[PDB]
């Protein structure tokens, strides 16, 4: 349809606000939708909603559309939000008065309360009429609005006080920075976990037993790499999750699965060699091959029972408005669990390999001091990294995720997010902690020519 | 850095008896398994003997109850006091040392080896 360059102006700032979709997907109340927030129908039939959005776009669609065509709805939208506006005598004035930049902000707080609620604020909206920038900013910030969704709300309130785009400048300048950030994180991820994998599947002199387990430990960090951090990424560089509240389940699922094995992984190869290092015969003949496979097979086992069964079944689930507004918004994500969850899932997956590790660990300690310059000094370094890199990573996150589960208020979503990814960097750190033999930098060369 | 002295080779008749002294010098760590590997022309190589720094032993069946391995309080050395010799005991024994300063892996320390040939 006809477009403007003010038009798309404004489709972008909602584009960074609430999201784009090409793709028929729900909303919170489960109707159908496309483009940016354009209801097709409240019918349960997804051929009805397709059948809406071949009429208006004038295209035999199938449910997948075009940008341009999410701008022509979009604009559809906005041209009805403005005659609303013209209608209503609380916010004709204010919108009469305003420039083209200042009127999208306008435009965008009635697509998220909509018009009576916009004209609820008489006097940001009288201070906004007289162009008192600053005065108006100051009294918006003290909203209900600001404090319910501070974020977009700051950037609404830069675009009044200063008439430009500012705010959506910043935010498009920060999330590609991300981007690139989260994308090497991704590679560190992947490459370095890959390369332990290969080297083991293709070095006779590595397939020891030991080994085995750091292969479990490599598997259990790749699809952490590739499915739990890429995906965990896009809430981080687009604030929402964009794949449907079923996706919202799996990647959740995915996530507890491989930290649960990858955590008990470095559990059991901290009771390997403290076998292998105190009682190494009676190690090499009580641990056959069957039995380190039965080891890894319990350790997977284990976290897809914490991980499957319990957030698909529901049982995760907390009760309050607070959650229960992110599980009926599927573009909502956030990792929100009841008391019993956070902490039964906790101890499965970090207190109780961290109590075997740092006993274990300790005892090496312990008569590597008993059967005595020295050497003591190379191998003790060593344990304070296996211990300080593994402790410094998960320790922040599971301590936030205990005490957040019962005060709610403690732990800020932004530092709660921050420590889950400290452990996330884990999954890099372990290739390089515990490959680190002369028979692996072989192979690794070996690989790399 | 680390080396290893081999001593108490040497050539007997069957039935004779010997007795292997192996001192590696250098820093090692508190947790460790002095050993002693053999090779036959032709055969690859095999244990005989290895002594963890606890005290645990290991002796291949083949070899046990003749052979006996032992340590030296407050001394990087290792023992192997070997008695009964049969003529099938033909092999460059070689002494190795596992050291555990990196917890994850084992790192091996061998040495260049001594003849041992028994004679009928």
């Known amino acids: 349809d006809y477009k403007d360059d003010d038009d798309a102006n404004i489709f972008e700032m909602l584009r960074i606000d609430e999201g784009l979709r090409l793709k028929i997907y729900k909303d919170t109340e489960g109707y159908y939708t496309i483009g940016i927030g354009h209801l097709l129908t409240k019918s349960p039939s997804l051929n009805a909603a397709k059948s809406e959005l071949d009429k208006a776009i004038g295209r035999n669609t199938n449910g997948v559309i075009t940008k341009d065509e999410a701008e022509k709805l979009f604009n559809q939208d906005v041209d009805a939000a403005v005659r609303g506006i013209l209608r209503n005598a609380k916010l004709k004035p204010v919108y009469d008065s305003l420039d083209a930049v200042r009127r999208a902000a306008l435009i965008n707080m009635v697509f998220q309360m909509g018009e009576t609620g916009v004209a609820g604020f008489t006097n940001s909206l009288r201070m906004l009429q007289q162009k008192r920038w600053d005065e108006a900013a100051v009294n918006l910030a003290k909203s209900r609005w600001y404090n319910q969704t501070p974020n977009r709300a700051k950037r609404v309130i830069t675009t009044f006080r200063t008439g430009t785009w500012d705010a959506y400048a910043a935010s498009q300048q920060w999330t590609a920075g991300m981007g690139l950030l989260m994308a090497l994180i991704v590679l560190l991820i992947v490459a370095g976990n890959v390369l332990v994998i290969v080297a083991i599947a293709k070095t006779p002199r590595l397939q020891t037993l030991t080994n085995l387990f750091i292969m479990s430990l490599a598997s259990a960090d790749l699809v952490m790499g590739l499915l739990v951090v890429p995906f965990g990424a896009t809430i981080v560089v687009w604030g929402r999750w964009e794949y449907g509240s079923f996706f919202c389940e799996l990647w959740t699922s995915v996530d507890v699965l491989c930290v649960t094995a990858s955590i008990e992984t470095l559990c059991v190869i901290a009771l390997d060699r403290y076998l292998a290092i105190t009682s190494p015969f009676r190690y090499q003949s009580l641990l056959t091959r069957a039995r380190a496979r039965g080891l890894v097979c319990t350790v997977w086992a284990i976290s897809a029972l914490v991980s499957f069964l319990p957030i698909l079944m529901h049982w995760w689930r907390a009760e309050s408005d607070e959650a229960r507004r992110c599980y009926n918004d599927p573009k909502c994500c956030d990792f929100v669990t009841n008391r019993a969850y956070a902490i039964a899932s906790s101890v499965v997956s970090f207190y109780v390999p961290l109590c075997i590790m740092a006993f274990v660990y300790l005892r090496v300690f312990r008569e590597a001091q008993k059967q005595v310059a020295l050497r003591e000094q190379k191998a003790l370094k060593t344990l304070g990294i296996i211990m300080g890199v593994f402790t410094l990573c998960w320790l922040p996150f599971f301590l936030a995720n205990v005490v957040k589960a019962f005060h709610r208020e403690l732990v800020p979503d932004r530092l709660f997010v921050f420590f889950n990814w400290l452990g996330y960097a884990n999954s890099a750190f372990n290739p390089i902690i515990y490959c680190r033999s002369p028979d692996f930098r072989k192979a690794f060369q070996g690989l790399l020519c | 850095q680390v080396q290893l002295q081999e001593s108490g080779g040497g050539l007997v008749q069957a039935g004779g008896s010997l007795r292997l002294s192996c001192a590696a010098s250098?820093?090692?760590?508190?947790?460790?398994?002095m050993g002693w590997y053999r090779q036959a022309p032709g055969k690859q190589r095999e244990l005989v003997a290895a002594?963890?720094?606890?005290?645990?032993?290991n002796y291949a069946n083949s070899v046990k109850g003749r052979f006996t391995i032992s340590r030296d309080n407050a001394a990087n050395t290792v023992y192997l006091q070997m008695n009964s010799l049969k003529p099938e005991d033909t092999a460059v024994y070689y002494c190795?040392?596992?050291?555990?300063?990196?917890?994850?892996?084992?790192?091996?320390?061998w040495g260049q080896g001594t003849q041992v040939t028994v004679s009928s």
């Open positions: 002594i963890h720094s606890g005290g645990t032993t």
């Open positions: 250098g820093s090692i760590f508190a947790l460790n398994i």
């Open positions: 190795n040392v596992k050291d555990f300063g990196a917890i994850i892996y084992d790192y091996d320390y």
